[PDB]
Design a protein around this ligand. Sequence first.
Ligand SMILES: *[C@H](O)[C@H](C[C@@H]1CCNC1=O)NC(=O)[C@H](CC(C)C)NC(=O)OCc1ccccc1
Ligand SMILES: *[C@H](O)[C@H](C[C@@H]1CCNC1=O)NC(=O)[C@H](CC(C)C)NC(=O)OCc1ccccc1
Lengths: 304, 304
Amino acid sequence: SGFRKMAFPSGKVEGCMVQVTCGTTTLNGLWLDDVVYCPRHVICTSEDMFNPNYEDLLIRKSNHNFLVQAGNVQLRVIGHSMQNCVLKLKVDTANPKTPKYKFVRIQPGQTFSVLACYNGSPSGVYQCAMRPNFTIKGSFLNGSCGSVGFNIDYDCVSFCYMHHMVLPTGVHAGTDLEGNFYGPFVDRQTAQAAGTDTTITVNVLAWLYAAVINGDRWFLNRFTTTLNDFNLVAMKYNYEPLTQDHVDILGPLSAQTGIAVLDMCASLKELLQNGMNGRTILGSALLEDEFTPFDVVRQCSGVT
Amino acid sequence: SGFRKMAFPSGKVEGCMVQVTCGTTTLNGLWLDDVVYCPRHVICTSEDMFNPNYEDLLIRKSNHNFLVQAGNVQLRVIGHSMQNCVLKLKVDTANPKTPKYKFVRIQPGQTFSVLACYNGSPSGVYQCAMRPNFTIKGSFLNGSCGSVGFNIDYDCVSFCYMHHMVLPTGVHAGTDLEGNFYGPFVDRQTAQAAGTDTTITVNVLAWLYAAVINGDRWFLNRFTTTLNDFNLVAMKYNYEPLTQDHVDILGPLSAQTGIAVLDMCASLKELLQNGMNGRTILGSALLEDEFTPFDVVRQCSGVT
Ligand SMILES: *[C@H](O)[C@H](C[C@@H]1CCNC1=O)NC(=O)[C@H](CC(C)C)NC(=O)OCc1ccccc1
Ligand SMILES: *[C@H](O)[C@H](C[C@@H]1CCNC1=O)NC(=O)[C@H](CC(C)C)NC(=O)OCc1ccccc1
């Protein structure tokens, strides 16, 4: 009953967060086994950040320049390396709280939980989606870099995001745990902008299925459509085109509800063409697109 | 940068969640020190739940009828007591993960984080507000009862909610950790309904201040108003009346932004009278009222 934007429990990740200070810059790192991962711009001063030469800046940093603190306890740095846009600080102690973990690069449309942190201390947790233009709409302040995004499949934490920067539009950009940015962005303070923020059609349809499951059906109409006809209207509205794989992925939701995917497409089309007329769906006056089909099934079936 | 509905990190609470089974009914309990707290309707069968006599049902339950499991490990129940609508199961082992904690009863308008659980295992976390009609809009399925709501002030967890039931409108009702329901509700499956779900005016104003902080200012107009004139319009819209204490509580937000509270009231009034005209504020097409003034300052200042 009810449907909410919901994050994974953050306990396994809280125990991996540390503070990393180099010079005057402080941010967060992720401590797994005997390695701390953090954004490489920790080495930049306020000035450096506009056109850094990271390799050159890194020549003048030695192991003892990276101050790593876990709680009130200092860790000893015994090595360091740059992998793309992240640093790997080898420490002399394996994190006793290291969970079963993996590093994954997610695709646009997929969702993950962000544990926002400051000074190595968890601040709060919320759910995000990797948007088609490879930005996320999170909540980050100065010092939040190194905060990570993750999913949990039972016992295993899959890290997929590390925060690096905010863009002129207020949306956020970052890397996977190998240091490769999502999107065309780079970790420097130059002119760079996001790109068209299109809507995750399949996710909206999943969310419409969630509403029906929870008894909110006012938007179901008597019509159906075709995939080709739907996309012609959807893309007038900057919706990602819907494919047969998307249809397949909504299959189980379609069967649980007895509503053909294309029938639901017909309902979405009229919502786009006519609006909500001041009504709401699952408490929203907008079509919500940051729930995947997996997300909906999860929350409507009690998976733990 | 950015503004999101955000929950406290759930780690300290994850370690307190256990599974409680009596007869055929399974739900969650909260294990603090040597006591497990859980809803008393764990003792009801499917039939009992329509007009239970809990005292009478409790006569036939002994310590060994309450199966308490922490992970894959069974706890030994050595005593039991009913306090209002919750049971206190004394166990022979103090929870080694017990945090510094307190039990508090919150007021309508205040917010807290819910850790949704099933079979004693955390499922996900999300932020809620205690609404003026003493319901919450969460995400709960069968077996979720005993999940708890909490705030964290640095090191101390303040438990304020335990889930018990869903209402015909799909909203949720529960108790504080002393077993007293919020609102007039009772833990039986009889005809009972919520009451008018009015809007937390002060919280909407806080959220409007959050938008301005994050550069979303399109809704600021050239007008001001009075508290009396504003409330005359606000209560046509089922908004809780705004008081001088509310004004005081928005003081720091008013000073950080240079916008008098009554000027912002004038902006809210025109948004109520004229709508959003299809625009959004912080990504919402609705006036959001589940952020307190404290919530906004927290998230816009990096408190950990
Ligand atoms: C790292 O913690 C930080 C996160 C930004 C700061 C405010 N909100 C965020 O999400 N990243 C940077 O400061 C970043 C550093 C370069 C090496 C990319 N630069 C950046 O995002 O610049 C834009 C900006 C900075 C400060 C305030 C507002 C916008
Ligand atoms: C306890 O886990 C459970 C939570 C309900 C079930 C579905 N979603 C919820 O939030 N509470 C009950 O089942 C409760 C038991 C009585 C002792 C109050 N009764 C209840 O909420 O009845 C309404 C209902 C039950 C089952 C499905 C849909 C509505």
